[PDB]
Amino acid sequence: LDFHGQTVWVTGAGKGIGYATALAFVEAGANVTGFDLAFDGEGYPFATEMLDVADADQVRDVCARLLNDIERLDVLVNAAGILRMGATDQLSAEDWQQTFAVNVGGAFNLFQQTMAQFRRQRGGAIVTVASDAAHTPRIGMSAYGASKAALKSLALTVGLELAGSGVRCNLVSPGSTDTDMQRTLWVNEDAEQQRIRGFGEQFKLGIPLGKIARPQEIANTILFLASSHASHITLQDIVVDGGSTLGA
């Protein structure tokens, strides 16, 4: 999958899926810029822009600055996100509000500052990282799954709005993935095997392929959706979860 010479932006690029994705675009030849709240590593194989995707003004400022110097934004990847868990009636107000400002507002702000650019150049590709929790109700994640469902719907209507301009807009929806947020947030030790088996009691199915996702495996799916191999694919959402939702 060749991306040589293309300008690619990736949010949440500091860790996990976003970092894996930004790195994959570099390994595919692209000119990559990663955006995130912090970049605490000592080095990054892409250019990096500190940015709070929930701060609508900061997004306007950084995008205006970078759009001044780039002809063309070939690929935008929305991968920012935060996970706040709890039963619906126990979730704190802060957790509810920041879940939405990040998981939905983040993209919203990026769309508001980039959609003119996509209309100007008349093409390119967008991929947004939703979640399996947007395809199926998840105990403990009512708010998180709902933000990712709003994100998906936002991204699809944006896709319909730009299709006249020839912009393809798609989503990937990951299941359980080996990340630092997932590792720490497990704590049950053999938690990785308990996830693969499933939790019948909470109506959460196991994983038929018998393994959890690797971040590179999400990133590769994004690269396909961003590439010209997917030249007739728009408004689709690919679930990457070993089959755990049985295709839902």
Q: Which residues form the catalytic set?
A: 144
Shortest distance, CB of residue 9 to Cl ion, whole angstroms? 15
Distance CA 74, CA 226 (A): 9
148 is annotated as contributing to ligand binding: yes
Are 178 and 196 spatial neighbours (Cβ–Cβ below 8 Å)?
no
Shortest distance, CB of residue 64 to Cl ion, whole angstroms? 8
126 is annotated as contributing to ligand binding: no
Phi, psi of 208 (to 5 degrees): -55, -40
Which is closer to Cl ion, CB of 59 or CB of 171? 59
Shortest distance, CB of residue 58 to Cl ion, whole angstroms? 7
Please, what is the end-to-end C-alpha distance for the chain in angstroms?
28
Which is closer to Cl ion, CB of 38 or CB of 160? 38
245 is annotated as contributing to ligand binding: no
Distance CA 217, CA 177 (A): 9
Report which residue's Cβ sits closest to Cl ion. 61
Distance CA 204, CA 239 (A): 16
Which is closer to Cl ion, CB of 61 or CB of 71? 61
131 is annotated as contributing to ligand binding: yes
80 is annotated as contributing to ligand binding: yes
Distance CA 193, CA 165 (A): 46
Distance CA 7, CA 125 (A): 11
Shortest distance, CB of residue 6 to Cl ion, whole angstroms? 24
Residues that bind Cl ion (CB under 5 A): 61
Using DSSP, state whether 49 is helix, strand or coil: strand
Distance CA 230, CA 130 (A): 19
CA distances 187 to 26, 90, 204, 233, 244, Å, are 33, 21, 18, 39, 21
Structure tokens at 188: 């049950």
Shortest distance, CB of residue 218 to Cl ion, whole angstroms? 30
Which is closer to Cl ion, CB of 2 or CB of 61? 61
Which is closer to Cl ion, CB of 58 or CB of 216? 58
Q: For the chain, what's the residue count?
A: 248
Are 155 and 220 spatial neighbours (Cβ–Cβ below 8 Å)?
no
144 is annotated as contributing to ligand binding: yes
Cite the annotated binding site for NAD(+) by residue number: 17, 36, 52-53, 79-81, 131, 144, 148, 177, 179
Cite the annotated binding site for ADP by residue number: 17, 36, 52-53, 81
